[PDB]
């Protein structure tokens, strides 16, 4: 199954980030990240972020080469991303802070 | 309630840290983020906090008082703090992973 959470960002609010994780394999769903990591990589400023303006296969080949993310495949071919890459990506964008009240003790 | 997770670090799985929730309050005890956390401080590397070392009133002073930490009090005193206070000292220490299984996303 799939879980999901939603939060926002820029000067009034609409620039959205979904981490989107499974259920079975712990993983963070690749392409969610890729519009706010190219703006970044771009001028260093996330609130310029147009959140429509996604990377095409060939952007989304060097953006992975340069921020060296290694990514997990599905049966599908969609990307994935284990969890210490996604809280690295988080803290490299000053982004925890935004998701530090999205997570909820459960006792294993 | 109280609610536990440990998990152990260092070279040889000797130094402890233990995540205990009160599931009334919501809050986590203070004290047992305090050996890593003095560690951390001094050398910034807590896998050579000492098993045997525990800080003193007023060494903890300091460190609530250099971290920004706040805490909330009990009928007996005891210090705890709040569950996103946790999560930043966790992400802090680069210990989140360790204790992944742990947290999950809030409900939506
Ligand atoms: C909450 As207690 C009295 O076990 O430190
Ligand atoms: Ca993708
Ligand atoms: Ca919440
Ligand atoms: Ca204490």
């Known amino acids: 199954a799939?879980?999901?959470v939603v939060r926002y960002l820029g000067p009034h609010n609409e620039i959205p980030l979904?981490?989107?994780?499974?259920?079975?394999?712990?993983?963070?769903?690749?392409?969610h990240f890729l519009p706010?990591?190219?703006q970044y990589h771009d001028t260093g400023?996330?609130?310029e972020?147009?959140?429509d303006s996604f990377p095409t296969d060939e952007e989304r080949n060097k953006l992975l080469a340069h921020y060296g993310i290694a990514?997990?495949?599905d049966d599908r071919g969609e990307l994935w991303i284990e969890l210490e890459?996604?809280?690295q990506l988080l803290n490299m964008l000053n982004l925890f802070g935004?998701?530090?009240?999205?997570?909820?003790?459960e006792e294993p």
């Open 36 to 38: 706010i990591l190219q």
């Open 98 to 105: 935004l998701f530090q009240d999205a997570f909820e003790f």
């Open 49 to 51: 972020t147009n959140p």
């Open 45 to 47: 400023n996330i609130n």
């Open 2 to 4: 799939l879980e999901e």
């Open 18 to 31: 979904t981490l989107t994780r499974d259920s079975e394999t712990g993983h963070f769903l690749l392409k």
């Open 71 to 73: 990514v997990n495949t």
């Open 85 to 87: 890459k996604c809280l």
